[PDB]
Amino acid sequence: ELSFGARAELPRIHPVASKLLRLMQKKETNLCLSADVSLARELLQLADALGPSICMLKTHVDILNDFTLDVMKELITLAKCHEFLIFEDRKFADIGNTVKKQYEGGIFKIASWADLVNAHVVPGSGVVKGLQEVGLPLHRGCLLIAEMSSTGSLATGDYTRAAVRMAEEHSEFVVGFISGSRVSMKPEFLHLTPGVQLEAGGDNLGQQYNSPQEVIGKRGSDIIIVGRGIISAADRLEAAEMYRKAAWEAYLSRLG
Amino acid sequence: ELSFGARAELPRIHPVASKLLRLMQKKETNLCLSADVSLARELLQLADALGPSICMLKTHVDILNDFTLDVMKELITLAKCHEFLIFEDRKFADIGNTVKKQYEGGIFKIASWADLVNAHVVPGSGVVKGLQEVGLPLHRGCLLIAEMSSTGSLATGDYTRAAVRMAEEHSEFVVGFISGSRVSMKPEFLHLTPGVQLEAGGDNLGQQYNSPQEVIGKRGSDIIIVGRGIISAADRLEAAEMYRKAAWEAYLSRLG
Ligand SMILES: O=C(O)c1cc(=O)[nH]c(=O)n1[C@@H]1O[C@H](COP(=O)(O)O)[C@@H](O)[C@H]1O
Ligand SMILES: O=C(O)c1cc(=O)[nH]c(=O)n1[C@@H]1O[C@H](COP(=O)(O)O)[C@@H](O)[C@H]1O
């Protein structure tokens, strides 16, 4: 198993994955903040304060009440300052012809500011083809959703294998997966795992939690995605540091 | 097999389905326009001119370059005038806690103006639970994506059966499906079928077309969803009338 720094140099590494892996090793962070807030001011204050602790800030631009492209300009300034990637968790899941417009256009212009986006594989590989026609020219990357954290997920067995094949056949654009575990044996591919909290439990709408030690250490994933475990805490900086130290030590102990 | 007018009166019918089925029978239309345009002025001019020919106008609010909630106010005025439902084809596909915010909030406030939305079933039933916590109080309905028109679709076999079970277990909110065919044997549930053109063919990004006669007449669906077959035509009114007459006659001939 290679360190994040060595994976950043693999011959077939995507430039976006390389940039991410480099700053993960430099900053000793494999934490992605899920900035699940409705106010631009809270999004930007979290990005600034937690920026040093995170490798990535995950957005849902479509729950932000006061979205403007200028908010995203301010977010990019913080991402550059503190060295993290921006991941818009849009979960593209339509035919190729539709997702290309949803990615490039409309009010959000996601491709203009998001380093990473993700897509469901259920529509077939046209979803990736459509996104890549916008994303390749704009030097972006994509994650495929191979497994989900929610109760009753149908992303199991042959579905997960199809996601891995689709990623591996589109390595020019696909840099990894949303998954609960290592699903690809190819080290050029990032594994990002949501459904993470230090304590056992869930929410009232099908979310299920596992710990950083379980998903990084035992299940072999690279990055934890954490929302409420940080966002709902009083001191979001100390919460982020707890999650960072947990995920980083779990990674180190798997390396040996 | 019951007429649309008789299905509108079924004991377990959802109010949104009833309203739709009534206006389908009144207007002799089972055509849903896929208004896949980037300009509000074009969206509204299509809605006004084609309103009499359609039972439903399907939107992708996130490809509209000049979206404002006022554009949707003008769309509702036309929907009321001409008697059609508004369907936002958002394809919600996240955990329940996330989709409730994506449906109610952000810039689009989809639940405030959309009669219908749709969701993927891959995350499990929490996607429906989350949407229904916004949609039930706002008297809205939802369609579940049981089959897809695109090449390589994984929405087959056990996946399609899971979508039908999920719909049937959430009949308070779920009024039907996006599908290629009749997938539910319960007549209270609408079947809407995209991937429709009069001529054989496809697009360059995995879209596959079947005719109105095939999907309404042979495959037993209720409503055709048509984008480019109308939108790319010079005379979009005559194109809409051709699709309406095709879908309506296919429906009548299945009734006998
Ligand atoms: O793509 C994702 O990040 C995602 C996939 C998944 O399987 N589960 C999952 O929870 N998510 C997202 O990750 C975040 C989880 O947030 P918390 O449950 O608050 O930690 C939410 O923004 C979800 O939309
Ligand atoms: O939910 C949908 O309407 C949808 C599902 C699907 O399986 N296939 C499909 O094409 N669609 C949508 O229906 C429309 C098809 O448009 P045309 O191919 O131009 O007729 C697009 O807006 C797609 O996003």
Computed on alpha carbons and rounded to an integer, the radius of gyration of chain B in Å comes to 17
Chain A nearest C-alpha distance from B156 (Å): 10
The helix/strand/coil state of A58 is: strand
Asked if residue B95 has its Cβ within 6 Å of ligand 1, the reply is: yes
Is A206 within 8 Å of B102 when comparing Cβ atoms? Answer: no
Is A89 within 8 Å of B89 when comparing Cβ atoms? Answer: no
Q: B254: which residues sit within 8 A by CB, 6+ positions away?
A: B1, B216, B217, B220
CB B141 within 8 A of CB B110: no
Ligand 1 pocket test, candidate residues A37, A46, A89, A156, most atoms within 8 A of CB:
A89
How many CB atoms within 10 Å of residue B235?
11
Nearest to A222 by CA among A173, A187, A171: A187
The C-alpha angle with vertex B109 and arms to B108 and B112, in degrees rounded to 5, equals 130
Count of all residues that appear for chain A in the document: 256
Chain B nearest C-alpha distance from A78 (Å): 22
Q: Which ligand 1 atom is at minimum distance from the Cα of A231?
A: 19
The domains located in chain A, with CATH, are 1-255 (3.20.20.70)
Is B97 within 8 Å of A152 when comparing Cβ atoms? Answer: no
CB A220 within 8 A of CB A186: no
The values of phi and psi at residue B89, to 5°, are -85, 55
Separation between Cα atoms, residue A240 and residue B256, nearest integer Å? 65
- Bin A219: left if φ > 0, else alpha if -120 < ψ < 50, else beta: alpha
Extract the tokens encoding B48: 């006004």
> Does residue A73 have an active-site annotation?
no
CA dihedral of A188, A191, A192, A194, whole degrees rounded to 10: 170
Q: Is A98 among the annotated ligand-binding positions? A: yes
The helix/strand/coil state of B11 is: coil
CB B160 within 8 A of CB B147: yes
Mutate to test the interface with A, among B97, B121, B134 (most CBs of A within 10 A): B97
Separation between Cα atoms, residue B60 and residue B34, nearest integer Å? 8
Residue nearest to atom 1 of ligand 2 (CA): B89
* Alpha carbons within 13 A on the beta-carbon side of B186: 17
Nearest to A7 by CA among A135, A190, A160: A190
What's the CA-to-centroid distance between A243 and ligand 2, angstroms? 41
Separation between Cα atoms, residue A237 and residue A240, nearest integer Å? 5
The experimental method behind these coordinates is X-ray
- Ligand that lies nearest to the alpha carbon of residue A212, given by its number in the listed order: 1
Strands B141-145 vs A174-178: parallel, antiparallel or unpaired: unpaired
Eight-class DSSP state of B171: T
H-helix segments, chain B:
4-7, 15-27, 40-50, 69-82, 96-104, 110-113, 126-135, 158-168, 212, 228-231, 236-255
Q: A32: which residues sit within 8 A by CB, 6+ positions away?
A: A54, A55, A56, A57, A58, A87, A192, A223, A224, A225, A226
Asked if residue A89 has its Cβ within 6 Å of ligand 1, the reply is: yes
The helix/strand/coil state of B87 is: strand
CA dihedral of B117, A71, A173, B38, whole degrees rounded to 10: 50
Separation between Cα atoms, residue B62 and residue A216, nearest integer Å? 35
The helix/strand/coil state of B17 is: helix
Separation between Cα atoms, residue B245 and residue B139, nearest integer Å? 31
CB-neighbour burial class of residue B213 (10 A; exposed 0-12, middle 13-18, buried 19+): middle
How many CB atoms within 10 Å of residue A6?
12
Ligand 1 pocket test, candidate residues A34, A88, A207, A222, most atoms within 8 A of CB:
A34
> Does residue A129 have an active-site annotation?
no
Strands B85-92 vs B56-59: parallel, antiparallel or unpaired: parallel
Q: Resolution in A, one decimal?
A: 1.2
The C-alpha angle with vertex B104 and arms to A88 and B137, in degrees rounded to 5, equals 150
Is A123 within 8 Å of B148 when comparing Cβ atoms? Answer: yes
Strands B31-34 vs B56-59: parallel, antiparallel or unpaired: parallel
Asked if residue A59 has its Cβ within 6 Å of ligand 1, the reply is: no
Separation between Cα atoms, residue B184 and residue B76, nearest integer Å? 30
Extract the tokens encoding B146: 């049981």
